[PDB]
Design an enzyme around this catalytic site. Sequence first.
Site, PDB file in Angstrom:
ATOM      1  N   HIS A  67       0.805  -1.208   0.000  1.00  0.00           N
ATOM      2  CA  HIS A  67       0.000   0.000   0.000  1.00  0.00           C
ATOM      3  C   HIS A  67       0.848   1.273   0.000  1.00  0.00           C
ATOM      4  O   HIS A  67       0.341   2.364   0.271  1.00  0.00           O
ATOM      5  CB  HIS A  67      -1.002  -0.002   1.171  1.00  0.00           C
TER       6      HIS A  67
ATOM      7  N   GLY B 202       2.614   6.246  10.910  1.00  0.00           N
ATOM      8  CA  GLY B 202       3.145   5.271   9.973  1.00  0.00           C
ATOM      9  C   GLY B 202       4.327   4.452  10.463  1.00  0.00           C
ATOM     10  O   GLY B 202       5.490   4.813  10.258  1.00  0.00           O
TER      11      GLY B 202
ATOM     12  N   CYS C  34       4.197   1.448   9.621  1.00  0.00           N
ATOM     13  CA  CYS C  34       4.022   0.443   8.590  1.00  0.00           C
ATOM     14  C   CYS C  34       5.381  -0.045   8.133  1.00  0.00           C
ATOM     15  O   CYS C  34       6.313   0.743   7.968  1.00  0.00           O
ATOM     16  CB  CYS C  34       3.260   1.023   7.394  1.00  0.00           C
TER      17      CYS C  34
END
Lengths: 305, 305
Positions: free
Chosen positions: B42, B144, B146
């Site tokens: 993503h 984030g 991530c």
Amino acid sequence: SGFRKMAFPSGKVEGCMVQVTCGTTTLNGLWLDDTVYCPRHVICTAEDMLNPNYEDLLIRKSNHSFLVQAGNVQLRVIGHSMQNCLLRLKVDTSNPKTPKYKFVRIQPGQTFSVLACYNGSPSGVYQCAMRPNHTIKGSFLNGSCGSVGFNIDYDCVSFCYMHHMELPTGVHAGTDLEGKFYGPFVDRQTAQAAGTDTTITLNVLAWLYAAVIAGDRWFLNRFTTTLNDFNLVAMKYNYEPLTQDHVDILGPLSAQTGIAVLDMCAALKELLQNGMNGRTILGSTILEDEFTPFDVVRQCSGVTF
Amino acid sequence: SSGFRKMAFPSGKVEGCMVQVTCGTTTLNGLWLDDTVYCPRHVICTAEDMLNPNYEDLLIRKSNHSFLVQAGNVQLRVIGHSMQNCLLRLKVDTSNPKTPKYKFVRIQPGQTFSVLACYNGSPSGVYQCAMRPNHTIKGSFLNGSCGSVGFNIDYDCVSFCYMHHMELPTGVHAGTDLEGKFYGPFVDRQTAQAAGTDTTITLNVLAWLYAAVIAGDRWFLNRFTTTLNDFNLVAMKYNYEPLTQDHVDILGPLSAQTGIAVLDMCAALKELLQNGMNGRTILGSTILEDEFTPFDVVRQCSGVT
């Protein structure tokens, strides 16, 4: 965004962990440049632990008497001096992996990361707080002596603690990277329990602020108290006296959450008197005091504006 | 009656594998092993695309130069790319000199590992946690994180088991294994998806009780035993994960080391759930900890690295 008890990345410290041996005794060492740090008690046997006279025991030793290893390679010691309760060993080669660093003495209530090692080998990492009575509720199962506590700001490592002895009570004591002890202790095998501990009010407050800023505030109330009035209570429940200094620190946190310190203080008072309803604050059934207001700020306010 | 901390694995090995990935407006973290950089797919998305991207397609749009990969300051030129489940595999022209011996392995619910939380390619904290029964992790992820990975170390081998993809309405986290495949039913888009109800990791409370026992804290043991069925027909009323025969088997080493048989410990735990702990504490704590695995114990209580 959820909470958790974080610790600094141990990588930079790992690169300095070495083993130091003297006789049958072996513990961890800190290798920074050409110098190696380790508890001066490495030069003692079941004998030299009841009442050693370190100065007498050190003259009786030579550079050759120290076995310093880097993983599986010997580092030869070419010099040695004793500073407080720590040994400073000179070695022919310098450590390439030595990070940018400082030696700072920590204040009770402050926090740090510990890299628990055994035989100079990184075993695990964890975050704890220098208890108000200078101990540490850590997990130092026999062997970790010589391990270090530290903080990492940016790319600089601040060494604050070194493990020295496993206290009879069960908690652990050590010194700062200068050989000075944290507490009323000595590296002797004499019985010496820990002083009366307390709960870190400042940290308990920062925590409640975190819980709140984390969208959870069932404990916040309508009341508000004064400082003397809060201590009268808190000191009852074995909490550390809260000072103006402490309220300042909780300033930024007071902002973000819109709650004022004395207010949040009123809430705690209510939590101490009215129990915790069986309810929970951040999943915890009890009040956590091992998070400095700074720690909270670094976990509930990302890494930017 | 001593100390036992929930510890994380030394983070050095994984630290030197963390890179920053930037694909336009988005900037996350990437795992760099050999000549491949892994990260959430993503990363090729911006604002509203995240409603239901057609990656495969949008991935054709992307060009190798589209991906900005950095390690400190060094520029990692990406000379290739391919998708794998929810993962993006970026081929770089430089094999990572710090690549540690490693393996990728899918973790089973309940099991634990360390997470080295990252930001813009740089580590900031490291903590221990467990893949929750509902397939999420109670971590501390902010701006984030991530691409941050979860791992376990064995001797010298690093087993990567987790990569963070997104935050959940729960204030919890969801991610995938190093093969791109997700943990739980979650997906890397954006629906109304939420975590299912959580339960207590029975297996882990038990391992912890064994740890307490081996520690010398055994006030809770008792003269009786129970049937797996009756234990479950009780514990499931206190929100516990049904104890399976396979679970009993995993506790084997520990029940063998302590002489205390699994169902005998269940008997002990069964009564701990019906008459509280009455102020009585365990390993210090006043709450039964469920994020310490049978192996976590075998690893700590046994001086090793």
